[PDB]
Amino acid sequence: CDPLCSSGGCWGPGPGQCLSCRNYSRGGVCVTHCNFLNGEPREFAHEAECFSCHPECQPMEGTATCNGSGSDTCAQCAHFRDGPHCVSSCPHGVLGAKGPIYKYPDVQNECRPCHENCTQGCKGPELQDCL
Amino acid sequence: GSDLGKKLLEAARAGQDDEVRILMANGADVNAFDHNGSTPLHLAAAIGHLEIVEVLLKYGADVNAEDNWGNTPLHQAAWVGHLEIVEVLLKNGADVNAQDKFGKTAFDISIDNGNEDLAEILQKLN
């Protein structure tokens, strides 16, 4: 039995063949620990199971990269942030409750609203910033 | 394919054509959806990347997927006037008469927006 199995034993030699794990598991395979502070993908744990952080979370050094699976649970967005969600890009006319939403990224990479009259995109919040 | 699907959503969102191709060849879930129900095809249709739309449909994207509001990618492409994308979605089985939460079709949207080129394509293609 692999050292990572719990006292219950195993059905095979490797870490993927334990009846239960000593602590963490990733995809049913017993591991020493999740990728909390190092490694790819960065991970969080839920009930001793390792799950991946969202790919838009910035990998953190020395501290956790996320506490959940969503792009709204990152310690820091790798690229831009739209409300609570880390995204690769700000909305480019993606439909919402009232039609296409267009946003521009500010100095801090935070997606901010385009003027309501910017039927296409914008580079700022003013009507003269359309396109 | 789920971790890859999350990456696929962001590559389609940013119009990263080469990235979408690598992700699809690696088995990414083509029908993944984000915090708004937008699938990669909805995100590709919004920015106007016709090659991403064609790659997603080649890898089996659902042409009639709905976001959190009942919008299909045909509704998305029509709202932003992406004619070429509208023509490709229709050729790949998009329901031309699919209605949004206000009972409106891609044709109703094109008339509401003054897009006569779009309205004419919808009339001629169906």
Numbering used by the authors:
A (entry chain B): 481 to 611
B (entry chain A): 11 to 136
Excerpt from the paper describing this PDB structure:
HER3 (ErbB3), which had long been neglected, has emerged as a key oncogene, regulating the activity of other receptors and being involved in progression and tumor escape in multiple types of cancer. Designed ankyrin-repeat proteins (DARPins) constitute a class of artificial repeat proteins that were developed as alternatives to antibodies. Here, the selection of DARPins targeting extracellular domain 4 of HER3 (HER3d4) is described. The DARPin D5 epitope comprises HER3d4 residues 568–577.
One of the selected DARPins, D5, in complex with HER3d4 crystallized in two closely related crystal forms that diffracted to 2.3 and 2.0 Å resolution, respectively. The data processing suggested two different indexing solutions: either space group P21, with unit-cell parmeters a = 64.87, b = 62.25, c = 74.54 Å, β = 102.41°, or space group P212121, with unit-cell parmeters a = 62.26, b = 64.95, c = 144.90 Å. In the orthorhombic setting two complexes are related by the translational NCS vector (0.00, 0.76, 0.50). In fact, the diffraction data from the orthorhombic crystals can be processed in the monoclinic space group, albeit with significantly impaired merging statistics (R meas and R p.i.m. of 14.5% and 5.9%, respectively, in the monoclinic setting, compared with 7.8% and 2.3% in the orthorhombic setting for low-resolution data up to approximately 6 Å). A comparison of the lattices revealed that the packings are almost identical. The only obvious difference is a small shift between the ab planes relative to each other of less than 1 Å. Indeed, superposition of NCS-related chains within each of the crystal forms P21 and P212121 revealed root-mean-square deviations (r.m.s.d.s) for all atoms of 0.164 Å (1554 atoms) and 0.304 Å (1657 atoms), respectively. The L86Q framework mutation positions the hydrophilic Gln86 side chain between the Val574 and Leu575 side chains, where it forms hydrogen bonds to the HER3d4 main-chain atoms Gly573 O and Leu575 N, thus explaining its selection.
